[PDB]
Amino acid sequence: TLGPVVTGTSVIAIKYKHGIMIAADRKASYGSYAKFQNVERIFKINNKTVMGFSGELADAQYLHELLTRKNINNLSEKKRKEDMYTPQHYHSYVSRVFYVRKNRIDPLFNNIIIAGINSQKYDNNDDNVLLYTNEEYKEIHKDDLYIGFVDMHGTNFCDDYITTGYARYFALTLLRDHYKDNMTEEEARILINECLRILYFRDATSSNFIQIVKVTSKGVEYEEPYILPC
């Protein structure tokens, strides 16, 4: 990949009391042309791990295929729920992939978020895994939650909230001002919607048509996509 052609815009992931909330608009732009407006940019890796991307769609799809087969091979060797790979394992794997491709000067034109739940001590969802078919949410400590960033050069880290693309300026300012630990689902949703509203007004490559995904004790849940209210 010489450069970006079909590009996805920002992704915003945050920790809240029941888990991870990760958001991205469903738009992929062909330069200034808003060619595709119902694209999925948050991918499920496993029941406690999701991946989001900003940048080139082809590279992101290639990475998604890699992580899909990694999860399947992990599932084949599994005997207990602790053998499932964690989000930090996938973050390290993606960081290594980006690092090697940087070394050979064949980068994936992407910024990647790998988010999820590190701990197996909250549910038995991995005891009997279903890949082809889908009580209250449990409060999860932030130490057991994981959000990790990777860029083109392989610069990799983790934090309580992560932003990619234009969200690194617009959303991240409001996040650093207003984020607090142990937010409810409603507060996290309101904060994310405010960030996406600012991005919709100021990022030309964004759209108001949002996809929200939640990683909680009951696994990965894809919310129905919605237009930004007001």
Binding site: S29, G31, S32, Y33, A34, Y166, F201, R202, D203, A204, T205
Partner: protein, 216 residues
């Protein structure tokens, strides 16, 4: 940017988006500029270049209007203005202003990259649309003109829906839908839609908030 002009039975409607500049520096802009009470122009291309062209041509139009005066005595939110010059005694012709703009653009077409759509009314040729292209060529359009990045996405659509003698209502609907579709498809165009309807005796400027709904 999307800028559109359409001649209908009793006037000419111009329309534009409001978005300026991946980062949106401004979302409430004025791409339609009032040169004279009977003459407006839509901009596309480099912003400073086009804006200084607007100032120069306003100066030219004011000079022409002052010189045109003969001696003696003779004879959805809208904002409406009636022409002070009721009989078009001294308002400059739309062709004259469009052609001096073409001359200025062509003389400086080494670096100027600006495409303009003049719309207006005078008593000689009634309502007119002129398109001044990038290198300083002028073409009079008798049905419609379109320019900017977004306009391409609506070309066939406008060509499908234009009628020779549209009323005010259906021309307004057509031009609004055209700018809405162009904004939906083009990232570089967005924000509130400004429309200017120019007629025999008045000009009315509309502002429109917009949303694209489809279940295609």
């Amino acid at each position: 940017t999307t800028i559109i002009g359409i001649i209908y039975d009793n006037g000419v409607m111009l329309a534009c988006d409001s978005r300026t500049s991946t980062f949106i520096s401004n979302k409430c802009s004025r791409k339609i500029n009032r040169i004279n009470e009977n003459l407006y122009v839509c901009r596309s291309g480099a912003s400073a270049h086009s804006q200084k062209i607007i100032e120069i041509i306003k100066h030219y139009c004011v000079s022409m209007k002052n010189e045109n005066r003969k001696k003696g005595r003779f004879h959805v939110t809208k904002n409406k203005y009636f022409y002070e010059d009721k009989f078009n005694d001294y308002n400059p012709l739309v062709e004259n202003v469009a052609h001096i703009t073409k001359k200025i653009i062509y003389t400086n077409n080494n670096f100027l990259s600006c495409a303009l759509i003049f719309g207006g009314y005078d008593k000689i040729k009634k309502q007119q649309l002129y398109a001044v292209n990038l290198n300083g060529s002028i073409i009079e359009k008798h049905d419609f003109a379109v320019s900017g990045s977004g306009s391409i996405y609506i070309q066939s659509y406008l060509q499908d829906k234009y009628k020779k003698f549209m009323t005010k209502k259906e021309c307004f609907n057509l031009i609004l839908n055209c700018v809405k579709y162009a904004m939906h498809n083009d990232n570089s165009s967005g924000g509130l839609i400004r429309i200017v309807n120019i007629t025999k005796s008045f000009v009315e400027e509309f502002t429109v908030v917009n949303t694209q709904m489809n279940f295609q």
